[PDB]
RNA sequence: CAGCGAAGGAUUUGGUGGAUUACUAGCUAAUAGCAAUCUA
């Protein structure tokens, strides 16, 4: 029916689900607004997917993010990964694929840990 | 040949004086291609 | 003259974002207060060994800078400073506390001497990094040493270590917190005023290197 | 710069049709694929025609003026081509499957044999312009009952003698006013008559059956009409005749059989001259030069041909190719000779100046997967599914080392340290990278870390770190040497194929399975950028698949990429019919080539014809499998802008000819080729040189370069500015490799890299393809000339200074 | 005028013009010979493919054609051309200056008629040959006998008679004795059509008022009359499959099917052909066939089939209406704008003044089909605007193709006349695209372009703004605002780095993408009306209004060339795909070619109609021009691809003329020089013994040698010696007949001495010396210190000593090259 | 709910016709006859 997309995002044990759909521009983490996200010093670590590329790309979508597990910094990395690749997948499916790889170029030039988590560790020396 | 042609994805094609030996190695007009150790 | 119009409806989204944040979307500043550009490593020989060309928001990038050899000389200098600042037996792991206390530190660095505190801490590093030392060579097990020179990675690392442990030792049993103690240590190191712990230890080490040269 | 015309097709020296010499015994026309190759024998060269047919071609002929040829494929889509300009002239659709076409000795009428009808047409002209309908039909004759098999003329253009799978063989007069001169019909053979020939004077008519019979018709008496005078015979037992030709003036018959044998006779005496074989598969086509010195034999199934001089038994060229087994490619580090590794397990070695092989290596049992060169030109390694990575010296042209595993696992990719001290191979079923020392053949180690099969390997050409890529969606960087053995992983989105790292050894291009190609700087783990290469590769819908070409996902990815040699442009090829090339700074496609436009290959068309679909099953899955189109491995040449791609029809080789282009460089209103020629005739040589470089017209470069005299080549080679050195260095290379003024070229090179050696020294990667062509030129003509002139010097000195008389 | 670069080839995309066609049968086939202006065309009628064309044009326009079995009789200004398979087989010049009007063919007597009621009839020399070749006589109808002529034909079963149909009377002839036989009655109004009937000896003839008289010429009466209100009748026919059906065609675009057995209208057809282009010019039943071939003047040919009846019992009373069957058309007005679709030069696009868009195919001329104006529905809830009636689109001005993402999203863009937006299309599935790209500043669209990565579209409005769009969503990306009047040309690079804007103000703005700043501005001193970017070579050629073609390279922003020499507005350019030439056509009825290296004008064709648009093919073989008049599109073949052409500035050394350059033999005698040709001659000569030993299966020269010996120069000997085969060289040089004197050996060593004295072919002279040394150097070592051969070897080494500078040079160069490529 | 929006809008599906390869006319006993017939 309504155009939606669901993406994930994982730090150590925290897991973030992101439902991105066409909307009016509201970004919610467990119903809380995006501004009211603890521990208040990594609010910009949460902000940087919606801040690197400008809010005009967020004007037509609305995002709801569930988070489980992990501590504080793991939850904020999971949130920002889910937000980022949800925006990328929405632009891959429903709008400009040129805007998709523009966004992918921006996020990968900043840090690709905002798009792909670094899973397979450790090393037996 | 028959077992690995059916176990694959890409297609596999399959007295007088001489059979003329068209697939020859060693040829830049070479006669003593041996090493001096080998001599 | 000339214009470029990219946006055609202003930013009015349903979760109303703070205005300083949607002003920071035009250009990235550290902590939404300090622009990383017009900040230069005044010295040579530490340029491309103190990362300042890649701006960040907070000093908590979670990259991997210890698996290869020299790639800890590419994570930015502010969180290099805060990772050395977290190191003591009482307070390991607490890098969020470390981030917020260097936030208060470089904030009062700005409100005392206002150019920008990232420039203050960059030329503090360039002035504190020692340029020679010695090595305790054997020599028959005598009192024997020989002056050598210092590679710039060791210079930057030893400067950061000297600044952080000097702030800790000057804030051990005083009224001042580690925040303002690191602030005054960085200001004295930026002037090179021969007063702070790191510049004193640097000139001492170069003095004994010149003596035993 | 990026306008790669289709230059040559290496491999597959003949597949299907009829060989044909030119008028002058210089060029041999071979029906290679859907195209025609031309092998120039004396000027030891070759090319392939750029035009293509929609199926495999089946008839070649050019007129005796050597001006235009026609070529006819399996359904009669005849295509004629200006031979001296290599462009197409007109397409035509003869309505049924042709068998043989022949221009006249006059060359004004060509007749062909479509099915049972023969038809004479008159030719168009090279001099008269390109008309809409140029073919004017002379006549069409229908005297036969089954398909015509062969066709000949008289020595003049008056009678035409045809022969068929109908047991008879007949004759015809080309005008309507010589009907009494020849209208009869020669019955009498047991099987398919496929030879019918006039003698040198037109009175004897030799006819040749399929089962080895030769009749000699002659217009003699018991008015009197064409009595058979003799039934000579062949008596090859299970070898019925496959192909016949007959040189009239030297009176030479040449017959190839089913048994893979040929014999040539002196026919009017019927004396067997030569009887000998080329293999166990039939000689499909004989043809003979007009001067009778040379013959040409093509055998289709092994794909071989052979031009044989029968007076003095000296073989001019004997060659054999492959088909749809061209599994990998390499260049020699001087871009002069190519190595083709083929899936039946053999290592052909071609060269680019000619078109011929010079050495196979028939060693491996099962397939050869990948090859590459190492250690300063003359070692190349080959890696198989036998369980063998074996070395090859390319001077003694022999094996010298064979590394195996410990358990016979099939290998899939290999790399080798540029300092040729370690050789690394990766498999499908062991998850490891095997490292072997090469100076001692023992297994050095096996290093692990993946959990899927390693798809591709590489070594960095400068700092010797290794980059592997595997189906764990993972690329992994090993630093092996120097006391450490340090690994570093890098995740990627989908699983990986086709790693290829830059000649600086600073970054790595990987070709992931989702249709994307990423680039990773290897000093960091940081991705520089990636090209979405999916929506710009046309993947042909097959004959048997029940999905569209759009939703198909057989080949929507790449399987071999390679850099250019400045590190600026990735060429890429996959299991689809597109080979693309991109430029990595702007991250954009800049050209896409299609590799084949014939439906004989499977996956060419993305939109199949609807009329072939039936109530059940398409009309091409009804047998009376079809080979897919793939490009298995693609490489840029070291010493050209040219690049090669090993597809199912052999090596395609595309190239730049900067001759036909206007590709200037910051000119303005005053600078003009007339202005450079006046600047040369008023002799300001430096100004005329840069005034020609700005035009970038290579014939002005040729003219100014030759007209500069010797006594100031140091002066102009000093004063030439910095931004023209890549152009002048690569020009001197690619002109000097086939030029003649050797001392002039060497004076120019000595002047250039004496006056400006240091600038090259600090811009090595700017001139990497520039002064590799120069070194190819040095060590592959000039060092040889010096070798023979020193041999003459020493043999003179010995034959004078020593004595002896007994 | 005649040309020297481009030869004209064919006017494609053209079907009919309005001349009444003819039809012919062959066995059980049917071919339609239609006229297109000057040449004609032969379609078949089953699949309606093209089959033939005239191989060369006519002097005037064709006014009337007919067709017997194999032969086509064309008729223009004074002649009648008997043609076979589209090739002219016999002219027939008429014995007058009067222009021919109509003709008919029957039996032996051909019969043509001029425009003054004079009828030349011709006769076959042999009652067995194929066509009437010989003049028989000249009848002449006078104004007493009837009006001025309008048709003539021989209706059937008449012994060498004929029927001339005037404007007022019908009048027969006996063409053997040249006699009139039966003038008919008087007819009270002008008649304009007369076609015979398949029943015995009657002819149906229709007037300018809408009545059809059915004259019975044997009876001399009329049998019936079909009355029709105020219809200018144009073309009758009859249906001959048994069921009798008359079919009239009215020049108001009507086709009326009358039954005749019960005098009833079976079915009318309204607006089948367009009214204003002539209506139904010619419509006929194929005989023994229940189909209809109509042709209008509006460049359209149609087939209408009659279905079998649905009443299996009643049958002929219930007649199903005519279906529509195959048809071939072009657009009926001269084409405005012209593009080439693919790189293979297979499809091309036209958009015409009658507001239709076509995809012509210049490969096979039954593949040409109209693109369709059926809007994709708005899937967000909106309703389609415009009007309720589906009119065609407004007139197309500009358009742009990029076949890079073809069919995956929208492909081509267009730019319509004086409407505020610019809709887009698709070329793969051939219909109108989803979106309409809009200018957002009320200015009409004047320039459109798109990136060669197929994503970004580019609208350039009349108010100077350049809005860029994405073409897989239809949304806007950014709005470049620099100009202050109508932007006339947009382009972007191959690799999307820099883009170029081109206004009417004279400002040419060099912008770059990915950083939306500009980086260059140029001001030319004229208004600018066109820009063609050569995406390969980064030049782009601009029109001006002081008639210059200013070529600017986009990198260093220089004005790199300025082509002067036109007299009126330059309507079009195209780069040659190599980028060497600019072909430009202009309103002084000229089309010139500029060789932009030399800046010169190679040739100028004086074309009779002003060519509006000029386009080169992706590959350099076809030049398609479209003119002021003519419904077609004329494609031109450049002979420059098959032969090299000059470069010489015309107005109504040969190497730099023909752009080539041969290499001289040697620069001077001081320099070495290898042999011209293969560099494998050296290896084959040095190894041909082991070459043949591995390739084995398991005198004139001596005459010339003593000639050159006694003349004491061996240059003719060396010219003989160099250039023949290695086998013959070794077989000759192996036997040199030297037992006591060795004069032949001294002559040969002195010959090689004189050869490498010149410093030429010295690799060959070295290997000839080495061949002799391997051949019979044993006798030289044996009777060494023989005075003659020792003198020959002494001065041979004394000339050989000069060739040590070569190894000094190459062992310098190799060592220093290895040093600068490694260290 | 809204707006878009010229005497309707938006979908499902059959049949026919044109393409999906590069356009030299049909038949036969074929240097010609036929196309109304190859028969005497």
SS (H, E, C) E431-489: EEEEEEEECCCCCCEEEEEECCCCCEEEEEECCCEEEEEECCCCCEEEEEECCCCCEEE
Find the Cα–Cα–Cα–Cα dihedral E502, E507, E513, E518, rounded to 10°.
Answer: 180
Residue D343 DSSP symbol: T
Instruction: Please list, residue by residue across C139-176, b when 16 or more beta carbons sit within 10 angstroms of its beta carbon and e when fewer do.
Output: eeeeeebeeeebebeebbbbbbebbbbbbbebbeeeee
Where helices occur in chain C by DSSP H, the ranges are: 19-24, 77-85, 95-112, 117-128, 152-170, 178-191, 197-211
Task: Report yes or no on C2 lying in a domain.
Answer: no
Shortest CA distance to E301 belongs to which of E75, E66, E19? E19
- Taking a C-beta distance cutoff of 8 angstroms, is the pair D186, D227 a contact? no
| Sole residue written with tokens 């632009």 | A91
CA atoms within 13 Å, Cβ hemisphere of D802: 12
CA dist., res. E566 & res. E240, Å (int): 60
Bridge-based pairing state of the strands E487-492 and D227-233: unpaired
Task: Verify cis geometry, omega within 30 degrees of 0, for the bond prior to D512.
Answer: no
The C-alpha R_g of chain E, in whole angstroms, comes to 39
Say if residues E235 and E283 touch (Cβ distance below 8 Å).
yes
Is residue C76, in this structure, part of any structural domain at all? yes
Rounded distance between C-alpha atoms, residue A22 and residue A3, angstroms? 6
Looking at the DSSP bridge assignments, the partners of residue E202 are E216
CA dist D297 and D277 (Å) reads 11
| Full residue range of the structural domain in which residue C89 is found | 8-213
Going by the DSSP 8-state scheme, the letter that residue D72 receives in this structure is E
Q: Is residue C15 part of a domain?
A: yes
- Is the CB of residue E528 less than 8 Å from the CB of residue E544? yes
Question: Using an 8 Å Cβ cutoff, are E396 and E357 in contact?
Answer: yes
Q: Which two tokens stand for residue E696?
A: 């084995």
Q: Do residues C152 and C49 make contact, with C-beta atoms less than 8 angstroms apart?
A: yes
Interatomic CA distance for residues E214 and E246, integer angstroms: 11
Residue with token string 């108001």? E252
CA dist E565 and E567 (Å) reads 7
Residue in E15, E35, E49, E115 with CA at minimum distance from that of residue E81:
E35
The C-alpha atoms of residue E297 and residue D217 are separated, in whole angstroms, by 64
D379 φ, ψ (degrees, to nearest 5): -130, 135
Instruction: List chains adjacent to chain E, taking adjacency as at least 3 C-beta pairs closer than 8 Å.
Output: A, B, C, D
A72's CB contacts (< 8 A; 6+ apart) are: A38, A39, A42, C96
Q: Coil, helix or strand for A49?
A: helix
- Residue ranges of alpha helices (H) inside E564-629 are none
> Does residue D196 have a cis bond before it (omega within 30 degrees)?
no
- Cβ D489 vs Cβ D476: under 8 Å: yes
Residue written as tokens 């004047």?
Answer: E446
Q: Where are the alpha helices (DSSP H) in E739-761?
A: 743-757
Chains A, C: CB pairs < 8 Å? 71
Measure in Å the smallest separation between the Cα of D491 and chain A Cα atoms. Answer: 7
- Find the angle CA(E313)-CA(E315)-CA(E320) to the nearest 5 degrees: 130
**Helix, coil or strand: residue E655:** helix
Min CA distance, B32 vs chain E (Å)? 11
Residue C89 forms part of a structural domain = yes
Q: Does D523 touch chain A (CB under 8 A)?
A: no
Our measurement of CA E454 to C1' F2, in angstroms, reads 36
Radius of gyration of chain A (CA): 14
Cβ pair D297, D283 in contact under 8 A: yes
| Residues forming a β-bridge with E584 | E573, E592
Shortest CA distance to D352 belongs to which of D738, D787, D739?
A: D738
Of D278, D361, D625, the CB nearest to B25: D361
Please indicate whether, in this complex, the C-beta atoms of D535 and E405 are within 8 angstroms of each other. Answer: yes
List chain A gaps (C–N > 2.5 A) by preceding residue: none
Own/partner contacts of D312-318, CB < 8 Å, gap of 24 or more, are D312/E727, D313/E696, D313/E697, D314/E691, D314/E692, D314/E695, D314/E727, D315/E695, D316/D41, D317/D39, D317/D41, D317/D356, D318/B20, D318/B22, D318/B24, D318/E695
- Report the DSSP pairing between strands E539-543 and E531-533: antiparallel
D133–E contact, CB cutoff 8 A: yes
Sign of CA dihedral D518, D519, D522, D524: negative
Query: Please, where are the H alpha helices in A7-71?
Result: 43-47, 49-52
Beta-bridge mates of residue D256: D243, D262
E89: enclosing H helix or E strand? strand E87-93
Helix axes E743-757, E700-710, angle to 10 degrees: 70
In angstroms, how far is CA E100 from the centroid of its own chain? Answer: 32
At residue D43, φ and ψ (nearest 5 deg) are -75, 100
Overall domain count for chain C: 1
Is-contact D321 D11, C-beta < 8 A?
Answer: yes
Measured from Cα to the C1' atom, the residue closest to F19 is E367
Chains that touch B (3 or more CB pairs under 8 A): D, E
CA distance E569 to chain A (A): 40
Classify residue E696 as exposed, middle or buried by CB count within 10 Å of its CB (0-12, 13-18, 19+). Answer: exposed
Q: Which residue of D has its CA nearest to A118?
A: D491
| The two structure tokens encoding residue E796 | 């041979």
The answer for D331, left when phi > 0, alpha when psi is -120 to 50, beta otherwise, is beta
Residue D57 is given by DSSP the state E
Instruction: Identify the structural domains of chain A with CATH numbers, from first to last.
Output: 1-125 (3.30.230.10)
Residues 6+ away with beta carbon under 8 Å from E163: E152, E153, E154, E155, E170, E171, E172, E173, E194, E203, E217
DSSP string, D723-780: GGHHHHHHHHHHHHTT-S-HHHHHHHHHHHHHHTHHHHHTTGGGSTTHHHHHHHHIII
- Residue where the block lists tokens 């030119």: D22
Which H or E run contains E283? Answer: strand E280-285
Pairwise CA distance, residues E59 & E76, whole Å: 8
- Resolution of this deposited model, Å: 4.9
In a 10 Å sphere around its CB, with 0-12 CB exposed, 13-18 middle and 19+ buried, how is residue A22 labelled? middle
Question: Which residues of A lie closer than 8 Å to C, measured between beta carbons?
Answer: 23-28, 33-35, 39, 41-42, 44-45, 47-48, 51, 54-56, 58-59, 62, 72-73, 77, 111, 113, 118
Least Cα distance to C180 among C123, C124, C120, C101 occurs for: C101
> What Å value separates CA E188 and C1' F36?
39
Considering the domain boundaries, does residue C1 fall inside one? no
Q: Could you tell me if D370 and D414 are in contact, meaning their C-beta atoms sit under 8 angstroms apart?
A: yes
SS3 content of chain E, % helix, strand, coil (to 5): 15, 40, 45
Chains that touch A (3 or more CB pairs under 8 A): C, D, E
Write the CB contacts of D151 (distance below 8 Å, at least 6 apart in sequence): D100, D101, D102, D111, D112, D113, D118, D160, D161, D162, D163
Residue D359 in contact with partner chain B when CB distance is under 8 A = yes
Closest CA to E332 of E375, E366, E370, E367: E370
- Kindly report the three-state secondary structure assignment for every residue of D221-281: CCCCCCEEEEEEECCCCCCCEEEEEEECCCCEEEEEECCCEEEEEECCCCEEEEEEECCCC
Long-range residue pairs from D445-449, CB within 8 A, at least 24 positions apart, any chain: D447/D478, D447/D480, D447/D485, D449/D476, D449/D487, D449/D489
C3 contact residues in E (CB cutoff 8 A): 481
3-state secondary structure D396-429: CCCCCCEEECCCCCCEEEEEECCCCCEEEEEECC
Calculate the alpha carbon distances from C146 to C143, C152, C158 in Å. 11, 19, 19
Q: Which residues contact E389 (CB under 8 A, 6 or more apart)?
A: none
Can you tell me the distance from the alpha carbon of E63 to that of E101, in angstroms, rounded to the nearest whole number? Answer: 7
Q: DSSP letters along C112-154, please? A: HS-S-HHHHHHHHHHHHS-SEEEE---TTTSS--EEEE--HHH
How is residue E676 written in tokens?
Answer: 């011209």
Say if CB D767 and CB E822 are below 8 A apart: no
Whether the CB-CB separation of E455 and E471 falls below 8 Å is answered with yes
Long-range CB pairs of D471-477, under 8 A, 24+ apart, other chains included: D471/D495, D471/D496, D472/A120, D473/D512, D474/A120, D474/D450, D475/D499, D475/D508, D475/D510, D475/D520, D476/D449, D476/D450, D477/D522
Distances (CA, A) of D113 to D72, D161, E125, E194, E430: 11, 11, 36, 48, 41
| Residue C100: inside a domain | yes
Residue E666's contacts (CB-CB under 8 Å, 6 or more residues apart) are D740, D741, E673, E759, E760
Distance CA A79, CA A60 (A): 20
Cβ(E431)–Cβ(E423) below 8 Å:
no
| Beta-carbon-side half-sphere exposure of residue E511 (alpha carbons within 13 Å) | 25
DSSP D618: B
> Judging by beta carbons within 10 Å of its beta carbon (0-12, 13-18, 19+), is residue E243 exposed, middle or buried?
middle
Give break positions in chain E: residue before each, C–N beyond 2.5 Å: 652, 698
CA E14 to C1' F28 (Å) is 36
- Write the CATH number for C191: 1.10.455.10
> Quick one: which of E239, E237, E241, E238 has its CA closest to E288?
E241
Number of neighbours of residue E383 by Cβ within 10 angstroms: 6
Cα of A1 to nearest chain C Cα, Å = 22
SS3 D669: coil
Would you give the distance in Å from CA C47 to the centre of its chain?
13
The token pair at E820 is 């600068």
The CA distance from E285 to E225, in Å, is: 21
d(C-alpha E479, C-alpha E476), whole Å: 8
Query: For residue E481, which residues of chain C lie inside 8 Å, CB to CB?
Result: 2-5
Residues 6+ apart with CB under 8 A from D82: D67, D68, D88, D89, D126, E642
Cα of E671 vs its chain's centroid, Å: 52
Helix (H) or strand (E) holding B5: helix B2-6
Residues of E66-78 as b/e, b for ≥16 C-beta within 10 angstroms? bbbeebbbbbbeb
């Amino acid at each position: 029916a309504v155009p939606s997309v669901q993406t994930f995002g994982k730090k150590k044990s925290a897991t973030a689900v992101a439902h991105v759909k066409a909307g009016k521009g509201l970004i919610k983490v467990n119903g809380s607004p995006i501004t009211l996200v603890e521990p208040e010093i990594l609010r910009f670590k949460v902000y940087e997917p919606l801040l690197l590329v400008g809010l005009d790309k967020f004007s037509n979508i609305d995002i709801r993010v569930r988070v489980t597990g992990g501590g504080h910094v793991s939850q904020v990395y999971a949130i920002r990964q889910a937000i980022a690749k949800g925006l990328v997948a929405y632009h891959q499916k429903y709008v400009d694929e040129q805007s998709k790889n523009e966004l992918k170029k921006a996020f990968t030039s900043y840090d690709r840990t905002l798009l792909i988590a670094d899973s397979r560790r450790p090393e037996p020396k | 040949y028959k077992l690995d042609v059916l176990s694959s994805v890409h297609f596999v094609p399959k007295t007088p004086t001489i059979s003329m030996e068209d697939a020859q190695p060693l040829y830049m007009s070479n006669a003593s291609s041996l090493a001096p150790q080998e001599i | 003259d000339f214009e470029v119009v990219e946006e055609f409806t202003p930013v009015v989204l349903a979760t109303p974002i703070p205005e300083e944040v949607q002003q920071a979307q035009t250009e990235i500043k550290l902590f939404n207060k300090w622009s990383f550009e017009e900040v230069e490593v005044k010295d040579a020989s530490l340029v491309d060994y103190v990362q300042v060309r890649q701006p960040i928001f907070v000093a908590h990038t979670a990259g991997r800078y210890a698996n290869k050899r020299f790639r800890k000389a590419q994570c930015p200098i502010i969180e290099r400073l805060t990772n050395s600042l977290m190191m003591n037996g009482r307070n390991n792991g607490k890098k969020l506390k470390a981030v917020r206390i260097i936030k208060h530190t470089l904030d009062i660095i700005n409100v005392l001497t206002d150019q920008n505190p990232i420039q203050v801490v960059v030329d503090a590093i360039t002035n504190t990094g020692p340029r020679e030392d010695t090595t305790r060579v054997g020599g028959g097990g005598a009192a024997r040493r020989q002056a050598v020179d210092v590679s710039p990675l060791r210079r930057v690392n030893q400067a950061i270590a000297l600044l952080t442990i000097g702030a800790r030792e000057a804030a051990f049993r005083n009224i001042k917190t580690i925040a303002e103690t690191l602030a005054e240590e960085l200001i004295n190191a930026a002037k090179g005023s021969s007063t702070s712990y790191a510049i004193k230890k640097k000139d001492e080490l170069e003095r004994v290197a010149k003596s035993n040269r | 710069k990026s306008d790669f015309k289709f230059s040559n097709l290496l491999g597959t020296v003949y597949r299907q049709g009829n060989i044909t010499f030119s008028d002058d015994g210089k060029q041999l026309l071979s029906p290679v694929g859907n195209r025609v190759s031309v092998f120039d024998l004396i000027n030891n060269k070759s090319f392939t025609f750029e035009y293509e047919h929609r199926k495999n071609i089946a008839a070649i002929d050019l007129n005796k003026q050597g001006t235009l040829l026609i070529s006819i494929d399996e359904d009669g889509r005849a295509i004629l081509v200006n031979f001296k300009a290599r462009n197409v002239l007109h397409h035509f659709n003869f309505k049924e499957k042709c068998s043989a076409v022949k221009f006249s000795p006059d060359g004004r009428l060509f007749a062909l044999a479509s099915g049972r009808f023969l038809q004479i047409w008159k030719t168009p002209d090279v001099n008269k312009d390109r008309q809409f309908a140029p073919f004017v039909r002379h006549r069409v004759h229908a005297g036969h009952f089954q398909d015509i098999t062969s066709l000949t003329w008289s020595q003049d253009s008056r009678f035409i003698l045809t022969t068929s799978k109908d047991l008879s063989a007949k004759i015809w007069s080309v005008d309507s006013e010589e009907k009494n001169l020849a209208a009869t019909t020669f019955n009498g053979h047991r099987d398919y008559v496929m030879g019918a020939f006039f003698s040198h004077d037109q009175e004897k008519i030799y006819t040749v059956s399929k089962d080895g019979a030769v009749f000699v018709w002659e217009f003699t008496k018991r008015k009197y009409s064409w009595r058979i005078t003799k039934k000579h015979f062949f008596y090859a037992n299970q070898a019925k005749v496959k192909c016949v030709t007959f040189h009239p003036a030297t009176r030479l018959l040449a017959v190839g059989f089913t048994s893979g044998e040929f014999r040539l006779y002196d026919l009017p005496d019927f004396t067997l001259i030569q009887q000998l074989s080329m293999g166990q598969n039939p000689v499909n086509t004989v043809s003979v030069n007009q001067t009778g010195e040379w013959l040409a034999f093509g055998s289709s199934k092994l794909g071989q041909l052979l031009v044989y001089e029968w007076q003095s038994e000296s073989y001019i060229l004997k060659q054999q190719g492959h088909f749809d087994s061209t599994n990998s490619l390499a260049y020699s580090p001087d871009g002069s000779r190519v190595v083709t590794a083929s899936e039946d397990g053999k290592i052909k070695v071609w060269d680019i100046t000619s078109g011929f092989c010079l050495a196979t290596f028939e060693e491996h049992t099962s397939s050869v997967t990948a090859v590459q060169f190492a250690k300063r030109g003359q070692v190349m390694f080959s890696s198989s599914l036998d369980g063998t990575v074996r070395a090859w010296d390319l001077i003694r042209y022999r094996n010298f080392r064979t590394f195996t595993g410990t358990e016979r696992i099939q290998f899939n990719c290999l790399a080798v340290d540029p300092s040729g001290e370690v050789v690394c191979a990766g498999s499908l079923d062991n998850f490891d990278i095997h490292v072997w020392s090469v100076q001692t053949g023992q297994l050095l180690d096996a290093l692990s870390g993946h959990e899927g099969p390693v798809s591709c390997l590489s070594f960095s050409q400068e700092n010797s770190v290794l980059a592997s890529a595997s189906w764990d969606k993972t690329i992994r960087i090993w630093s092996i040497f120097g006391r450490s053995q340090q690994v570093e992983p890098i995740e990627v989105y989908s699983d990986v194929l086709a790693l290829s790292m830059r000649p600086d050894g600073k970054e790595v291009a990987v070709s992931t399975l989702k249709g994307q190609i990423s680039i990773f700087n290897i000093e960091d783990a940081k991705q520089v950028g990636n090209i979405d290469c999916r929506k710009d590769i046309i993947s042909g819908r097959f004959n048997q698949d029940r999905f569209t070409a759009k939703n198909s996902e057989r080949s929507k990815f790449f399987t071999t990429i390679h850099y250019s040699f400045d590190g600026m442009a990735i060429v890429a090829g996959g299991n689809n019919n597109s080979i693309c090339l991109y430029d990595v700074p702007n991250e954009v496609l800049l050209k896409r080539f299609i590799v084949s436009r014939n439906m004989a290959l499977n996956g060419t068309l993305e939109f199949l014809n609807s009329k072939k679909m039936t109530e059940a099953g398409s009309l091409d899955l009804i047998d009376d499998m079809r080979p897919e189109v793939r490009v298995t491995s693609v490489q840029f040449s070291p010493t050209a802008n040219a690049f090669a791609a090993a597809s199912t029809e052999g090596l395609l080789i595309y190239s730049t000819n900067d001759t036909i282009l206007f590709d200037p460089f910051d000119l303005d209103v005053d600078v003009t080729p007339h202005s450079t020629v006046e600047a040369l005739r008023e002799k300001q040589f430096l100004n005329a040189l840069v005034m020609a470089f700005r035009l970038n017209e290579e014939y002005l470069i040729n003219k100014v370069y030759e007209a500069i005299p010797i006594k100031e080549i140091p002066l102009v080679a000093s004063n030439i500015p910095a931004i023209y050195l890549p152009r002048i260095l690569k020009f001197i290379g690619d002109f000097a490799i086939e030029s003649q003024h050797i001392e002039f070229n060497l004076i120019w090179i000595k002047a250039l890299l004496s006056a400006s050696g240091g600038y090259i020294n600090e811009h090595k990667y700017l001139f990497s393809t520039a002064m590799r062509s120069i070194q190819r030129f040095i060590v592959r003509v000039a060092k040889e000339v010096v070798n023979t002139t020193t041999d003459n010097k020493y043999t003179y000195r010995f034959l004078v200074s020593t004595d002896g008389s007994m | 005028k005649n040309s020297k670069i481009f030869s004209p080839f064919r006017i494609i995309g053209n079907v009919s013009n309005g001349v009444p066609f003819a039809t012919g049968t062959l066995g059980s086939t049917f071919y339609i010979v239609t006229c297109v202006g000057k040449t004609f065309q032969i379609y078949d009628a089953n699949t309606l493919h093209l089959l033939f064309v005239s191989e060369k044009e006519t002097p005037s326009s064709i006014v009337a054609l007919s067709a017997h079995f194999h032969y086509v009789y064309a008729a223009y200004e004074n002649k009648v051309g008997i043609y076979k398979r589209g090739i002219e087989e016999h002219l027939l010049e008429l014995e007058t200056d009067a222009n021919v009007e109509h003709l008919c063919i029957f039996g032996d007597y051909l019969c043509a008629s001029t425009d003054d009621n004079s009828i030349f009839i011709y006769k076959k020399s042999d009652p067995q040959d194929k066509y009437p070749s010989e003049f028989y006589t000249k009848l002449t109808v006078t104004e007493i006998q009837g009006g001025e002529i309008v048709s003539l034909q021989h209706l059937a079963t008449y012994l060498n008679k004929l029927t001339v149909v005037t404007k007022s009377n019908v009048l027969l002839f006996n063409v053997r004795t040249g006699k009139l036989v039966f003038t008919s009655n008087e007819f009270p109004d002008q008649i304009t059509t007369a076609e015979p009937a398949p029943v015995l000896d009657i002819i149906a003839l229709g007037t300018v008022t809408g009545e059809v008289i059915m004259f019975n010429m044997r009876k001399g009466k009329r049998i019936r009359t079909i009355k029709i209100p105020q219809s200018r009748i144009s073309s009758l026919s009859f249906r001959t499959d048994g069921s009798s059906h008359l079919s009239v065609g009215t020049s108001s675009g009507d086709l009326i099917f009358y039954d005749l057995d019960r005098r009833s209208r079976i079915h009318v057809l309204k607006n089948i052909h367009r009214e204003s282009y002539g209506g139904v010019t010619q419509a006929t039943f194929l005989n023994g066939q229940p189909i209809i071939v109509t042709s209008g003047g509006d460049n359209s040919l149609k087939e209408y089939v009659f279905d079998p009846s649905l009443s299996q019992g009643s049958g002929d009373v219930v007649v199903q209406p005519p279906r529509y069957l195959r048809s071939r058309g072009g657009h009926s007005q001269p084409p405005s704008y012209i593009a080439f679709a693919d790189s293979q030069s297979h499809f091309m696009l036209s958009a015409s003044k009658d507001r239709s868009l076509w995809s012509f195919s210049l490969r096979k001329d039954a593949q040409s089909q109209e693109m369709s104006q059926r809007l994709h529905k708005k899937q967000d809830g909106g309703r389609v605007g415009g009007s309720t009636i589906k009119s065609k689109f407004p007139e197309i001005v500009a358009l742009a193709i990029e076949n890079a993402r073809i069919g995956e999203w929208e492909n081509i863009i267009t730019a319509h006349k004086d409407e505020k937006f610019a809709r887009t299309w698709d070329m793969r599935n051939k219909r109108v695209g989803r979106w309409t790209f809009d200018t957002t500043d009320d200015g009409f669209v004047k320039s459109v372009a798109m990136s060669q990565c197929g994503n970004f579209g580019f609208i350039g409005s009349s108010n100077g703004s350049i809005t860029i769009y994405n073409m897989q969503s239809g949304i806007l990306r950014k709005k470049y605002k620099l100009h202050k009047r109508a932007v006339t040309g947009i382009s972007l690079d191959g690799m999307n780095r820099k883009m170029v804007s081109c206004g009417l103000d004279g400002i040419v703005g060099f912008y770059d993408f990915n950083k939306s700043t500009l980086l260059g501005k140029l001001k030319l001193d004229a208004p600018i009306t066109a820009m063609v970017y050569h995406r390969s070579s980064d030049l782009f050629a601009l029109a001006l209004d002081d008639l210059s073609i200013v070529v600017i390279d986009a990198v260093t922003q220089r004005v790199v060339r300025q082509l002067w020499g036109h007299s009126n507005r330059i309507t079009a350019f195209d780069f040659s795909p190599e980028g060497r030439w600019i072909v430009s056509a202009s309103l002084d009825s000229t089309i010139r070619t500029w060789d932009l290296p030399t800046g010169g004008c190679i040739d100028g064709i004086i074309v009779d109609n002003v060519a509006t648009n000029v386009k080169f093919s992706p590959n350099g073989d076809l030049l398609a021009t479209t003119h002021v008049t003519g419904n077609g599109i004329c494609i031109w073949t450049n002979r420059a691809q098959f032969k090299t052409v000059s470069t010489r500035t015309i107005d109504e050394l040969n190497d730099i003329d023909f752009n080539t350059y041969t290499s001289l033999e040697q620069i001077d005698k001081e320099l070495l020089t290898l042999s011209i040709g293969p560099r494998s001659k050296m290896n084959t000569l040095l190894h041909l013994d082991v070459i043949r030993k591995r390739s084995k299966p398991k005198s004139h020269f001596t005459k010339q040698l003593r000639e050159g010996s006694q003349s004491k120069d061996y240059s003719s000997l060396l010219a003989t010696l160099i250039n023949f085969s290695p086998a013959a060289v070794d077989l000759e040089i192996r036997s040199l007949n030297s037992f006591e004197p060795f004069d032949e050996i001294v002559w040969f060593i002195d010959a090689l001495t004189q050869g490498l004295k010149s410093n030429k072919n010295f690799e060959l002279y070295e290997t000839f010396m080495s061949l002799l040394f391997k051949a019979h150097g044993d006798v030289i070592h044996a009777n060494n210190k023989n005075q003659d051969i020792a003198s020959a070897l002494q001065n041979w080494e004394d000339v050989h000593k000069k060739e040590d500078r070569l190894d000094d040079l190459v062992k310098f160069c190799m060592g220093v090259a290895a040093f600068v490529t490694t260290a």
